[PDB]
Ligand binder design. Structure first.
Ligand SMILES: CCCCCCCC/C=C/CCCCCCCC(=O)OC[C@H](COP(=O)(O)OCC[N+](C)(C)C)OC(=O)CCCCCCC/C=C/CCCCCCCC
Ligand SMILES: CCCCCCCC/C=C/CCCCCCCC(=O)OC[C@H](COP(=O)(O)OCC[N+](C)(C)C)OC(=O)CCCCCCC/C=C/CCCCCCCC
Lengths: 53, 439
């Protein structure tokens, strides 16, 4: 059994997603476009952070 | 009756089609792809695992010198060290203080964890697609599952669908695939018999039950230290355990086109590439003569609200006069506009409301409701929400179905330019004619 992270606090903007994250421990965040070029990216977040995808 | 059509390979978006057999009431079928699967054909190359170095108890020669016996084994290495003085708990083991030699030997084997913790290196070279389809035939939701190679035809409610082959041969898997448990990685593993130490494939076995293990780990024996009776050595660590730490990200998280990957067997699910030919074949007894279906006349359209959202942001209200009570099949005659309803009940002099979705900012489309057509028109307005969790239900925008009314600015400016050019050309040709006649 492995845990599930807390739901982030999402907020939208023009062609953007603003995500506020509350990790309790090193958590992996990855994202990819769903088109021809996925442009995969990832990072471990270890504290509270805000991302702009 | 045989009807052949093409729908995009997008999963979760329903598409409508018009089975128009003239002389009979039109029939509209809404079909949606619940899932599309690509299952490559796999030929196993070799299993990789964690090696286990087997060191038998060292043989010390008391008052003599031992010889290096040679035998064939995966990574056999044997060495003889002279001048050792082994010490056990109760005192020295050998009699003399010198001329004692220690015989060391070691080889490698597949660990007992081979049957559980192993990575399989494959070759993937052709894919047999499958598909699960939801088709709304005659006002009933019926779900079919069939092969999308164009060969399996599934009969549902007496009409049979034969779906595929997919228009695109694209597949997320390369020619060489390695799977570990539920993750599959696009990597070019070294061929059998050519593994390198400390890298993936240093120990290779053809099958998890074979015995001719190929192992290349540079096992080097080292001299025992200061009267100890151990067997030190210097070996490159397991390449496979190093790989497990540095795998990277599986195909499930990096494959393009939103592809989903699974195992047992390895499949790629719900790609968003290309489109899917699909052929219906309806019995001639399913249709209804045009003189028995309701016939709509005196039709007119008004479009009160119209927002070009991803979901159905438009509403059109159509006045009609119906010959008799019954169902009618509503279909949009314009590709740019998608109508959510597939059929609606109709009776008397009344009105019906259909919900449509468009990307146009000046909606102009024709809606056909049971053999009768009507023209629609509205000015759309953009939505406020910048992001949604569902894909667009409407077709993308072309450079022709473009330029809303109040693009008349383009016509006006290009007409002014054309008038100036025409006046200039007229004056030029008049002068040319007058100077050509004059001589
Ligand atoms: C101050 C006075 C101002 C007056 C105000 C009025 C101004 C009003 C106008 C603004 C201009 C309108 C521009 C808007 C364009 C809309 C964008 C569009 O609608 O486009 C979308 C597509 C994008 O593609 P996609 O990936 O979404 O589709 C493929 C889908 N998938 C990948 C699944 C296969 O774009 C395409 O495809 C287009 C393909 C062709 C692109 C080449 C364009 C060539 C046009 C040249 C124009 C010059 C005239 C020619 C001269 C001839 C002499 C008469
Ligand atoms: C003193 C005596 C003077 C007398 C006056 C004489 C002047 C008379 C006039 C000349 C004006 C003609 C100019 C040529 C324009 C013709 C094009 C046109 O007639 O339209 C064609 C269609 C109209 O649609 P429809 O409903 O008829 O067809 C659909 C029918 N249904 C709905 C039933 C399916 O439209 C289309 O298909 C799209 C057409 C292609 C559009 C290309 C993309 C637009 C790009 C624009 C870029 C310009 C940039 C401007 C900003 C620059 C900065 C300054």
């Amino acid at each position: 059994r492995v845990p599930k992270a807390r739901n982030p606090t999402v907020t939208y903007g023009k062609n953007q997603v603003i995500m506020l994250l509350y990790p309790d421990h090193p958590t992996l965040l990855s994202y990819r476009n769903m088109g021809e070029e996925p442009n995969y990216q990832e990072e471990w977040v270890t504290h509270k952070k805000e991302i702009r995808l | 009756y045989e009807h052949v059509t093409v729908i995009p390979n997008t999963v979760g978006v329903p598409y409508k089609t018009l089975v128009n057999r003239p002389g009979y009431s039109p029939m509209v079928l809404e079909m949606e792809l619940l899932s599309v699967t690509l299952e490559p054909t796999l030929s196993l190359d070799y299993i990789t695992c964690e090696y286990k170095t087997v060191i038998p108890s060292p043989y010390v020669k008391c008052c003599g010198t031992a010889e290096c016996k040679d035998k064939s084994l995966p990574d056999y290495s044997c060495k003889v060290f002279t001048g050792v003085y082994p010490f056990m708990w109760g005192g020295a083991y050998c009699f003399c203080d010198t001329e004692n030699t220690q015989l060391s030997e070691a080889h490698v084997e597949k660990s007992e964890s081979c049957k559980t913790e192993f990575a399989s290196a494959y070759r993937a070279h052709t894919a047999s697609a499958s598909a699960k389809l939801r088709v709304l035939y005659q006002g009933n939701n019926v779900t079919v599952s069939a092969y999308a190679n164009g060969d399996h035809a599934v009969t549902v409610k007496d009409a049979k669908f034969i779906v595929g082959p997919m228009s695109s041969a694209w597949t997320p898997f390369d020619n060489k695939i390695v799977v570990y448990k539920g993750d599959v990685y696009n990597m070019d593993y070294p061929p059998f018999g050519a593994g390198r130490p400390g890298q993936f494939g240093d120990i290779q076995s053809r099958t998890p039950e074979s015995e001719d293990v190929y192992a290349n780990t540079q096992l080097v024996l080292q001299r025992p230290s200061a009267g100890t009776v151990h067997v030190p050595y210097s070996q490159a660590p397991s390449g496979f355990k190093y790989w497990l730490k540095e795998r990277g990200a599986s195909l499930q998280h990096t494959a393009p086109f939103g592809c989903q990957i699974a195992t047992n067997p390895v499949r790629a699910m719900n790609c968003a590439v290309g489109n899917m030919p699909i052929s219906i074949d309806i019995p001639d007894a399913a249709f209804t003569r045009v003189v028995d279906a309701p016939s709509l006349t005196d039709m007119s359209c008004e479009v009160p609200a119209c927002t070009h959202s991803s979901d159905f942001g438009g509403v059109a209200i159509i006045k009609y006069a119906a010959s008799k009570k019954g169902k009618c099949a509503v279909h949009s005659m314009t590709n740019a506009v998608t109508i959510r309803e597939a059929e609606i009940e109709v009776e008397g002099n009344s009105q019906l409301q259909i919900s449509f979705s468009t990307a146009l900012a000046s909606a102009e489309f024709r809606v056909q409701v049971c053999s009768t057509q009507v023209h629609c028109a509205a000015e759309c307005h953009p939505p406020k929400d910048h992001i949604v969790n569902y894909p667009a239900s409407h077709t993308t925008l072309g450079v022709q179905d473009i330029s809303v009314t109040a693009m008349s600015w383009v016509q006006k400016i290009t007409g002014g330019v054309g008038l100036v050019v025409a006046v200039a050309a007229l004056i030029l040709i008049v002068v040319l004619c007058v100077s050509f006649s004059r001589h």
